Amino acid sequence: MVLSDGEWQLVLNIWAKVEADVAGHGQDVLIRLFKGHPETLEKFDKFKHLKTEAEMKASEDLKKHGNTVLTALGGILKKKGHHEAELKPLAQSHATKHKIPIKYLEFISDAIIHVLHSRHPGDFGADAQGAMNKALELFRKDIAAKYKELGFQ
Ligand code: HEM
């Protein structure tokens, strides 16, 4: 389920803009995730104390984790169609340690798309949106395959 060269270029072109403020994007993504799907917040022992959007926005640890998430995703995206090594430890920890259903990965994928549109209305047009959908679909597909191996799928 392979992206074209042009599709990868669109993905990484918008991603280079994310990289001007990775932590801010990452915090926005986690806030969108937690507000839209509160069950996801409950998987984070270290964030479940946050009861309001303002509290989420004020948390420096949440911002840091947002940076961690998007920096790791950036690493995956820059490997384009060959991200096996980067994806492996992530699937492993999310399956066995953090116990994160694939469905929650769908939720965060949608949150990323939402945030990219919110912050970049002009640059993140339909072509880039579609290419980013495909890149995040491939991410989910490959994680789900590792989950299946490990009996978490
Ligand atoms: C784009 C998708 C995601 C990426 C790239 C990502 C990345 C990471 C990374 C790099 C870490 C630290 C290293 C590790 O433990 O593997 C981490 C930790 C963690 N992730 Fe994710 N993650 C993603 C999605 C999610 C989702 C959707 C959830 C929950 C709904 C989640 C829950 C957790 C938890 C609970 C930890 C440990 C947090 C702590 O330090 O207390 N992850 N994630």
Residue numbers in the entry: 0 to 152
Reproduce text from the manuscript describing this model.
Hemoglobin (Hb) and myoglobin (Mb) are the key molecules in animal aerobic exercise, as they are responsible for molecular oxygen (O2) transport in the bloodstream and its storage in the skeletal muscle, respectively. In the present study, we investigated the molecular evolution of whale Mb by experimentally resurrecting ancient proteins. The analyses of their chemical properties and structures demonstrated how Mb molecules evolved to adapt ancient whales to deep-sea environments. The atomic structures of the synthesized aMbWp, aMbWb’, aMbWb, and swMb were determined by X-ray crystallography to 2.4, 1.6, 1.4, and 0.8 Å resolutions, respectively.
The aMbWb and aMbWb’ proteins are the common ancestors of the toothed (Odontoceti) and baleen (Mysticeti) whales, which would be closely related to the early whale Basilosaurus27. The seven residue replacements; namely, E27D, V13I, T34K, D53A, Q116H, K118R and N140K, were deduced to have occurred during the evolution from aMbWp (terrestrial ancestor) to aMbWb (aquatic ancestor). Two residues, G1V and G15A, are different between aMbWb (polyphyly ancestor) and aMbWb’ (monophyly ancestor). Although the side chains of G1V and G15A from aMbWb’ to aMbWb did not appear to be interacting with other residues, their introduction might increase the rigidity of the main chain conformation. Furthermore, the ten residue replacements, D4E, N12H, I13V, V28I, G35S, K45R, N66V, G74A, D109E and F151Y, occurred during the evolution from aMbWb to extant swMb. Unexpectedly, log S0 decreased during the evolution from aMbWp to aMbWb, and remained almost unchanged from aMbWb to swMb, indicating that the total solubility in pure water has not increased during evolution. The folding free energy changes from the intermediate state to the native state (ΔG1) and the total free energy changes from the unfolded to the native (ΔGfold) slightly decreased from aMbWp to aMbWb, whereas they significantly decreased from aMbWb to swMb. The analyses also revealed that the adaptation via the ZMb-increase strategy reached a plateau at the last common ancestor of whales (aMbWb’ or aMbWb).
